[PDB]
RNA sequence: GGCCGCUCCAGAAGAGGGCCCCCUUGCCCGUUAUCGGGGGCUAGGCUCGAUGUCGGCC
């Protein structure tokens, strides 16, 4: 009977400066036997602390960590512009050893409206026997955001794939792809093609269609 | 004093195949030490996959790779090794190697207080394929506030990665390219998109270049505007 | 009634086993290895005890 660590929230944006406390909670009691690593993007993780709250060498004094029965936390005091990172908790007080799913800390910016742009499948795909629909919402913030299809005004589900990118390294914002997929033979039977983009940043719904064949 | 962990031996291998890992550290002694493999599906986090000390030769698993892979330790080399046996699509991952210093005065083993760079493991029937390459064309129906916004569809290519660039690189502002995803066929699709001035569309050209060095395709296409 | 005993019956019978919690390992301890002390439970299902509502002897 192995030991759960549940992290949340799985995303928070914060500022730098700001006081940052992520928590992770054991399923059952590991007593101080929890550890906390640090990754960023394309890099292998980093201890933080370990036994809950002892900060690991070379470790700046900025992060501290806590225990409340079964709930702990890292700390972050003021965040620097370095700790925008990927936060695990591991538990050791059992074997075998269980990681938290990760915190990702972001960085929080002000609220922008996507840009959406629907493009229909080139002649070129459909000539090869498929047809990829693409709904592009471009340079948002926050990162949550709903795209509903329709075709011909049913909507779809199951056929399509969402891919975001990873903050701007410039203005910290999203950009995401809703790509719908069908055969030639489907598409043809259809005739109006939708994306619907929900989001913060938007009064209502928009919605980005087109006809097939014109 | 530097501790390092250097890994090798991923690669692609197909369901059912083997591959070897090695992870060569200095210093510090691995009979010093508790050694494991982490591994990191993509987008995914952390799973342990076994761990080894090597002054007793204990070892443990994982349940899910009981049987099929053999941790192992060379301390005439200082190094250690993750042998996988019958693999599988689910065990694609990135594989760290990392350690635990061995304390005398300690009672247990504590945290993994180093991790290696990490080696790359991908199973999959799939066979090497570079990508179809599909305009994402701006239309005169699609301009908003004096932007168009145009890219390429790079679709069904195997394995990961392909690099795309605009314009040989000279068109860099305003560009995304997606994250690959994975198609249920087992093979990857992405597109690139770029934002730029719709007064533009007529007096510049736009190419993307598409790189995937796995099937050595180098592919220039032109995505120009459709008229009416 | 008496003595001897558990080889079968009874659960009227307590330890082993197992689960949870506190104490940053906290008398002493600790397999290159997570303990100790305390607390909350689990009983007749296995083992070993003990018992008689059991068996033998007189
Ligand atoms: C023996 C000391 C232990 O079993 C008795 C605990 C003392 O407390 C009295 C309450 O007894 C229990 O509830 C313990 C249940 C018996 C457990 C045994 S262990 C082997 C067998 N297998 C299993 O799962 N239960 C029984």
């Known amino acids: 009977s192995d030991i759960q660590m549940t992290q949340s929230p799985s995303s928070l944006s914060a500022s730098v400066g700001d006081r940052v406390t992520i928590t992770c909670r054991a399923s059952?009691?590991?007593?101080?036997?929890v550890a906390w690593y640090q990754q960023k993007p394309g890099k292998a993780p980093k201890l933080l602390i370990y036994?809950?709250?002892y900060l690991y060498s070379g470790v700046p004094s900025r992060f501290s960590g806590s225990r409340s029965g079964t709930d702990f936390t890292l700390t972050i005091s003021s965040l620097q512009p370095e700790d925008f990172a990927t936060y695990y908790c591991?538990?050791?007080?059992?074997?075998?050893?269980?990681f938290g799913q990760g915190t990702k800390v972001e960085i929080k910016r002000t609220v922008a409206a996507p840009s959406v742009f629907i493009f229909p499948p080139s002649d070129e795909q459909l000539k090869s026997g498929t047809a990829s629909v693409v709904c592009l919402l471009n340079n948002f913030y926050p990162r949550e955001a709903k795209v509903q299809w329709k075709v011909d005004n049913a909507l779809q589900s199951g056929n399509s794939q969402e891919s975001v990118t990873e903050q701007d390294s410039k203005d910290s914002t999203y950009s995401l792809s809703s790509t719908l997929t069908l055969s030639k033979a489907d598409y043809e039977k259809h005739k109006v093609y939708a994306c619907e983009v929900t989001h913060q940043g938007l009064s209502s719904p928009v919605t980005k269609s087109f006809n097939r064949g014109e | 004093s530097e501790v390092q962990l250097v890994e090798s031996g991923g690669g692609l291998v197909q369901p059912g195949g083997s591959l070897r890992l090695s992870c060569a550290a200095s210093?510090?002694?691995?009979?010093?030490?508790?050694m494991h493999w982490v591994r990191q599906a993509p987008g995914k986090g952390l799973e342990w996959v076994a761990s080894?000390?090597?002054?007793?030769?204990?070892?443990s698993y994982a349940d899910s790779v009981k049987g099929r892979f053999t941790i192992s330790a060379d301390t005439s080399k200082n190094t250690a090794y993750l042998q996988m046996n019958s693999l599988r699509a689910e065990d694609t991952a990135v594989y760290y190697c990392?350690?635990?210093?061995?304390?005398?005065?300690?009672?247990?083993?504590?945290?993994?207080?180093?991790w290696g760079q990490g080696t790359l493991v991908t199973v999959s029937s799939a066979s090497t394929k570079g990508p179809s390459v599909f305009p994402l064309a701006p239309s005169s129906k699609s301009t908003s506030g004096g932007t168009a916004a145009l890219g390429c569809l790079v679709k069904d290519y195997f394995p990961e990665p392909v690099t795309v660039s605009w314009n040989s690189g000279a068109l860099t502002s305003g560009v995304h390219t997606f994250p690959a995803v994975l198609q249920s066929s087992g093979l990857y699709s992405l597109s690139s998109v770029v934002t730029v001035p719709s007064s533009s569309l007529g007096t510049q050209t736009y190419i993307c270049n598409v790189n995937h060095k796995p099937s050595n395709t180098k592919v220039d296409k032109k995505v120009e505007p459709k008229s009416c």
């Open positions: 080894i000390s090597p002054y007793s030769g204990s070892t």
């Open positions: 990392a350690r635990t210093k061995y304390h005398y005065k300690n009672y247990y083993w504590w945290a993994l207080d180093y």
């Open positions: 059952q009691s590991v007593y101080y036997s």
């Open positions: 210093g510090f002694s691995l009979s010093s030490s508790s």
């Open positions: 036994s809950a709250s």
């Open positions: 591991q538990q050791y007080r059992r074997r075998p050893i269980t």
